[model samples]
Each structure stands twice: as C-alpha cells, then as structure tokens.
Target: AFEISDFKEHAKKKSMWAGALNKVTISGLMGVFTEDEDLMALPIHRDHCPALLKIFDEIIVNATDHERACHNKTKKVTYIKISFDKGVFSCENDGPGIPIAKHEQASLIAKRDVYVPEVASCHFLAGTNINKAKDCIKGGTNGVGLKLAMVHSQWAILTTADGAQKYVQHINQRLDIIEPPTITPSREMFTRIELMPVYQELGYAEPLSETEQADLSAWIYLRACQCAAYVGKGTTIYYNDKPCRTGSVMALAKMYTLLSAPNSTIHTATIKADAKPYSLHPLQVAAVVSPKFKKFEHVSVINGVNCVKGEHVTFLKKTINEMVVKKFQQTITLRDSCSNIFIVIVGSIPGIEWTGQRKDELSIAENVFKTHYSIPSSFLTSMTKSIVDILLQSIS
Candidate 1:
C-alpha cells in the first residue's frame, strides 16, 4: 500500500548509524532510540503530561545548547520563543541554523548524497557532537533526543535558515512517511520546530480538556522561567509572546522562595569553585537559605532542568552534615539549617551521567581514589557553609 524506501540492505553497514534507525517501526522509536530502559518501557504516549513534557525537555535542551555554544563565541544575546496551542508545540531560536550541506555517505535511500539536515533529523545517532571536544558543556550531547521527540509525535516539521538557504523537513506518521525537503533561497538566521503529539491514538481526549491545558501551560511557563535562569541575561525567552523573565542565577534562586518560603532571617549567596579535568570553567552555585519551622524542603535546578533528589542534591545535604553540623557541634540539626533552602547548581562537564532519560537525576561516579563529581564537592561545601553561617546567626 505504501512505497517505503528500502533501508534494510543499507542497515547492514556498520558505518551507517542511520541504517540501524531505518529498521525501527513506528512504535519502536523510543525502544530503539533511547538508552534508558526505564523510559523505553514506560507508556509515555499513554500518559499526557509526562509524554509531552519529555519532548519539551529535549527540545529546550537543544535550543539552549545551541545558544550556549554560540554565545560563548559571539557574546551576542540569544532569543528563544516557545508556544503551545491546540496541542501543537513550537520553539524558535535566533542562533546558528543547521547547515544545508550534503551527507558524506549516500545510499539507495537517495540516489545522491542526502542533505545533512535530512539525515540528522530523520536518522538515529547522527548527533552533532561528533566533532566537539570532550569538555564541551552542551545539553544535547546525545543526538537522539530531538529525533526521538520527532518520531513520537503525529507530525514534525523542522525549518532552519542560515542566510543562504532555507531548508524544511516534514516527518509524519511516526517516520513511516518522509516527504522530500523544501529548500529555498533565503536570508534568515533562525531555526524553528513544530510538532503535534499523538493524542487520540494514545487515548487522550481530543481537544484536550480545560484542566489539561492549564496544567500544560503551567509546566511551559515554569520551564521557560527555568531556561531564562540558566541562560541568564545573555538570553531572553518568550512564552506566547509574554516574557518569562528571571534575570540572573541568584535571582532565580530567590524566585524559588515561592516554593520554599523563607523565614525572617534569609541569606542568598553565589558560590564558585574549581572544576578541573572535568570542565573548562568553574562550577557555580546559587543558594537561598533560611531557618525553617516546617519540614526540610529543598528545590534544586541543574543546568536549567529541575531535578528530583540526585547526586548534587546529596552532595549539598552531605556538605551541610559535615561542614554545618560538625562545626556548629550540632547546635542545630541538618534539618534545622536546610529545611528551607533553594539551590541552583550549574555544571558543564564531560562524562556527565543522568539517572534517567527524563534527566531528573545527575548520577555521581566513584572510582578507586576518590568520589567523582561533575561539580566539585568544594563548591558544594562552600555553599553549605554559607547556609550554615546564616543558621548560626539565627540561633545566636
């Protein structure tokens, strides 16, 4: 019934990662494309928010990584715009666009060398980081993220313009159908993506309920705010044309007070420490500390993504235990000092590991000599001490 291009023969070649991708069925996209087994087995599409939010996370990472790399070189401010309407999600960024070059390895999938953008978006394992240095601090290190986001949707369109050419790729029916690209001459310098998740087939009600839309909007605004925090004054983000502005890292930590209300005695600090061998730059932490009468609560943001309890969080707790508890001679329990704290730990290091594909946890590795961290424990301890000093002040 359909004239799908034969990629089975092409898949046998070890050199072609895209070849392996051609073998995956529509439903097998997540299974084959994702490295996290937990994420692979879950019914992501069946669930409404998790499914869409994961896609949102991946796309945001891609956009922010692009901005980070370019901002480092040009020092130019970045603009990121995002919107979700009628179940479709869209993001646009004013950064360098994907190049319109020919792929090196051409096969029967196309007579000549297929375009680079076509292969990169449509294929698996075609990550752009192949040429990057080991210490490059990028969010989209694994190229499969955006592609996975693409195939999971009912339809996805990617448009990139680099002043010379504007190329658009349309993928639909979960990669079962791929139309020839539309390339035109242009003088634009932005990349845009639009995708609609498969709702009805996944059993979500058509025309998402009012409550569902409200929840999605909240998630979007929150993520946009987090993104604004991560990129700092160097980038501006728009959600539905309204600015989601939270200026600097310290300000973002203060914003966390909404979640973890502070007491009369509050202290905020920006701490930086050495990050050698793992990264080219120093690891920084923005913290908000206050004594609490309620239970211990903490809100942590890492590399712009909100995290559940993870290694960095554990490190913070441990630092408080060692630096604050020991020094103060248990004048205050760890709970007393840290029960109301908000922390944002920023990291850009090689060999970073996450507990899951949702990137909810940053796993710390332990080797023979010492415990390893993408962010040095010294940074964590410094921040912990900062909080501890405030706690001491409140007590005395």
Candidate 2:
C-alpha cells in the first residue's frame, strides 16, 4: 500500500495533460517517498511511477478493445476483467496474445531500412504513436496507448503460444528497461495487466454510489461499441462488478439520457472521413436539443485524460473550441451538463491531433464535417437544423 499522506501532499498539484513532464508533475516527485524498499528495490528516477500509472489505464482499455477487434472468434465469449479497488486497477483479457518474436521482428524491420513490411513494429512503448487502420471504426488512432500503459502499470503478463514461454520486461519511471526481457514458461493464453496507481490520487469527494457504478458500466458498453464495427456484441465489461454488454443500447437505458428538458429531441449523425463517407470509417455524434449545453458525467479528451462517468462518453477527437458547443450549452444523455452541449461521437477525426500525452489539436467540428467528407450539404445542415427547430418550437 502507498502512503496516503505523501500522496495527498503532492497530488492535485498539476495535470499531466501534455505528456511532457512539467515543473510539477506526478514523476516530479521521483526521489521523495516512503522508506520501504521491499517493493522499492530500485532507486532514484527509475520507473516514471506516476506518469506510467496514468498512461497504463488507457493501454489496458485499448488492449481489451483490440482483443474484441481481432481475436474474438467464438461465442465462447472471450472476456475482460477490470478490477479497480483500493486505489489500484487491473485489467485482464482472454484473447490471442501477441507473439513476442513477431513483435521484435517488426521492430527490426523498421530499423533495417523501410518502415514497411511491418508498418512500425509495435514492440516498444516509448513515444506518441498513431496506429489506426487506414479505416478503423471502433475508435482508436494514437499508438501511444500501449506505451503509456506499458510504463504506468506493472509490466504486462503476456502468455502466448510461443516457445513454451512466459516473457518478462521491467521498466523504471525514467523509461529504463531490464534488457533481454525475461520469460517464464506458463500454461495460460491471455494478457493480464495491473496498474499500481498509488501515486494517482484524484479529487473524488467520496466513493461512487451503486447507481453511479452501473451508469459507469453502461459507459463501458458504449465505448466498446465505438471501438469496433459489425458489433462483435461479444465484449462484456464490468466496472466495479456492474457489467454492460457492448452490443445493446437499451441495456444502457437503465443508464440515464443526458438532457433534462421535457420536450428535447435527440439526433445522431455520422462524421465521416471526407474521402470515405459511408464505410464506417467516420466519427458519429448523438446530439440532444439543448443548444446551450454544459459539461457533465462523461468525457474523454485525448488518451490518458478520460473520465468515463465511470461510459457513454464524448471523445472530443480535439481541443474543440467550436461554435456548435458554444451555441448549444447542453447536457449529455447519461449525465447532466448545463453549460456545454451534450454530444456523442465514435471514431476519430484526423484533423483532431494531439501532440502531448493528453493533448488535442485546437480545431473546429467542420474539419470533421467539412474537410473530411464529400457527403451532401443537406444531411449535416439538417442535423443542425433539427436541433435548432426543436429548441424553437416552445418544445420545453
């Protein structure tokens, strides 16, 4: 267990939004902590403790999504377990584990000459990487999720069909590694991750209630939908023992809608990659009739800066200082936000770039609606007009 006192002293001091360590960041307290080296065998600026813990959270989440994406072959029901208790979080997935040899080979190809043949070996988790397919729909773009989790959480446990092997890699806060990563043979076929986010103190006023927990699980169900296409409807995610099936929307009805007005209308529109409008390669948004929306229970603003409510979420895809949000001041479906508009979207907008750990490019929604697609003017305009008309009709 980590010291609550020491954690309290340093936390809430800064935000790790930019990925770069600032003057007052979680890793900034590298050399100042408890006197117990039992779990503290290493010393002085080793494992980016705070930052990696922060990052690993997303890695585990994305890994689960990727699991549902590639290897969910049967109704045998592959699973993911996310246990967050006592200030620590762990996620496990039963899927086709990555082959160590192939991962390394990919890296070697990148180094030899052409970044081709393997398309940037994902073996290492060091920098900001974007590894989305040319047309990915389930909602991920940045390749950095794994690297961040690789650093933040306890080293990932990968059990694969390679060489009767159980491989091991250890990293320090400074991103140093214990070379020739070890592998102990095992009889399992899955990836298990643990995040010792001890230094990850937050400003939660109290423990979340049961209803809130279920509401949060609804969130998990929805993000899974956002992450993949054709709906494996396979992934079952439970946050705090509350499970939400990724395929069903009404399963989320127990999860509240965002706006509060009696006569509010709901509209959902797809924001496609301009070049490929209908191929599920676009982002989607569900907007209610509240033109003047406020922030609420759900939001994910870049990779490591997500607040799942604890899951019908809003992936900003950017810094998003748009007139749409400004004009509509609304609340989301699952939660209430009276200042900003309640919005929903799945998939990434290429123009929404992020340079830092939790950074988003300052851009407009038009980059999504205008720059990307060659769809009709009627639909986007109709989507906007519908919300406006509902608000104007003395609708509530």
Candidate 3:
C-alpha cells in the first residue's frame, strides 16, 4: 500500500515533476470520490505510481475550468476531494456539475482524434491555459492535462449536472468497444470522476517523495487562496479524507473571516451636481505613515463636504484626509458594521478631469456607497458644483 510517507518521499525526490503529477491526480480523485466513503479510504500501491496521479489531477483541473467558463463564477464554492487505493484513484467536486453531452464529446474526441488542431488550440489557449497566472496550485501546460489523465486510467466515470438535468458517462476497455459510451440525463448538478490505474498497460511507476508532497501541499494551498481572492469566498480541500492545511489556505480563511467580520468597515463616495439631487453616507478610510515620520492629526470632510474650508484645492485635500481619518475612527467605534458610506456631491464641475477607467471606478464607488446607505441612485444627482469639486478633489 502507498503510505502517506511514501507519497511524501517520492515528492521529495521528484520535486516539480511529482508536484505537477500530484496536482492532477488529486484533482481527478476529488471528482471521483465526492461523497463516497469507500473511495476516500482507498490505499495506493507502488504499481499505481505518479503518472496515474498526474493524469487524474489534469482532468479535474480541466473540468474545473470548464465549470468556471460556463458559469462565470469563482471556483471558491467548489469542493475537490481525492483518495487512492491499490490502483484506483477518484476525484469529485461540488460544482454546478458536468454535462453528459460534454463527457460524451470528450470520449468521442479522444477516440477519433488524439489531437484536433482547432479544438486543441481552444482547449490549450483559452479553456485551460487562459488563467495560468492565476493558478496558485499545481501547474500544467493546458487542457492537455485532462486528456492525459484519460489515457492513463483503465476506466473513467464522469458525472455532471447542467442546469436541472444530470448525466453520467462511463468508459472502460470492456465497455468502450461495444457501446462507444454516451451521456444521459440525470437529477443533480455535481460531477464525480473515477479512474482505475492500469499499471502494466501504462508501463510506468514513479513514486512520490517528501519534497513532492510539500510542493503539492503548497499548490493546493495556493489554489485555495486564488479561489478565495477571485471569488471573495471560502474554499475547502480534502486529501486522504482530511482537510489539507496550507499557508495560502490559511490566508484565504483569514481573509474570509475579516470580510465577514461585523466590525469591518468599507467606504465609498460619489460626486455630481447640487441642483440635481444628492446622497450622503458615512465614510471609512485608513492611513499608514512611515515610522520615522511623526503622525499628524488633520481635519477633513465627511462624505463630500469639508466641515472646515480654506484654499479651494488645499482645503479639498485637507478636508478629504480629515474625513478619511474621522471615518476610520467611526468605523472602529461602530464595530465595522457599516458596509460603506456614500459621499455624494452633485454639481457641474468643469475643471475636473474624467478618464474612462476613473469613471468606471467612480461608478463602482457610487454603487458600493449606495448599497451601504440603502439609497436610490436617482436621488444622489442634485448637489452644487462647489461640493462636487471638493468631492472629486478629495477622491483624486
């Protein structure tokens, strides 16, 4: 049986190669074992080596990317689980599920053309390779990973959910010839992938080492973090039926905690014209200064108005700084319950410059502020030019 120690040692020796393989294998297994206890407890043997693992990981990652592409949602909410025994490794996920039609296509494509130039490029460049930089976990060239996994496995069972329809596709040497495989509708929206390693057929078995284990761990951890960063949500990974602890994983968890904290404060503001109509909300800001320099106390504006005024430009800057500080204090005092504070100053300000990106930023700012204040956007456009100028200046 392949002990955890054996996997670790193999990883130590192989490093990057083993690390990459582990990522693919684990992801694949996750899809297979979703809620299957028996699969989760499977043991790994030397005969069922690293190549199998690598292939599995690649397939799962591809599946994940597919889900993301179709849904336009972050993978944070998805769950991947992996387990191995003898020559079998399973992977599963709690995503929107896979479509049987896609699974069937994968099978037909694998048989008819090992490499279809057009489809291959799309899979390589857009599907799997599109977000390489964002891959905080195991890395590979492109969607080829999944294709590799299929080749390594003696059999693969893919289950998926598309909207309200659920489907499953099974492929094994014994069944491949007679049926040519097909996808049929089912009842749920999740996917599970199962792989049985045909060691003798594949002709390879490279054990995992300690270093490789650490590398895989790091990959999984980073992947979790990336998911959290992109989705602004939490992610959980299971290895050998236990949760994998990783630095990036911990960081993601912490981020979620902070985001969900009742005392966390966010600030947003906007400016328009006074005669139009305007909105107001509390502001929250943070300041950081070099330790070598003394921190100075300053007075600024709340929302877009400076309770105190001086030179037009200088006053605007000073007022903004003061308001930020004041908002920061208020955030702390209120236990961060406020989602945002809208500072809407409406007016026709001619001198202010507006860039496309800046305008987009302002729109986001306004939306966030309005959401927090629970005010309507139509009501926020009626302030004066002077106030709008001050608000714009403060933001700048």
Deviation of model 3 at 325, angstroms:
38
Cα-based lDDT for every prediction: 0.61, 0.38, 0.35
Query: For every model in order, what is the number of clashing pairs?
Result: 0, 44, 59
- Give model 1 RMSD, 1 decimal: 9.1
Per-residue lDDT tens digits for candidate 1, residues 1-396, read 855444322222221322222112222111101223210111113224344566677887788878877876753437989898998889999867888878767444577657877776777666777565645667665566676666667799989988789999898876667778899999888888898866554445667777556556656766776677677457899887877756555555555554334333233343333345542444356665555424444445555555555655565665556666675675566666566565665544455566655666666553301343433455545656666676777678
User: What's the C-alpha lDDT at position 13 in model 3?
Assistant: 38
Model 2 over residues 249-305: C-alpha lDDT tens digits?
222111224224324544445544535433334434544435443343222222212
lDDT of 2 at 310: 14
36 in model 2: Cα distance from truth in Å? Answer: 42
TM-score-wise, the better of 1 and 3 is 1
Better of 1 and 2 by TM-score: 1
Candidate 1 lDDT score relative to the true structure: 0.61
| TM-score against native, each model | 0.75, 0.52, 0.37
- Which lDDT value does model 2 have at 212? 29
Question: For residues 144-201, what per-residue lDDT tens digits would candidate 3 score against the true structure?
Answer: 4443444445566655565566544555552232223344455555666676655544
Ranking by TM-score: 1, 2, 3
Best by lDDT: 1
* Native-to-model Cα distance after best TM-score fit, residue 333 in candidate 2, in Å: 24
Ranking of candidates on lDDT, top first? 1, 2, 3
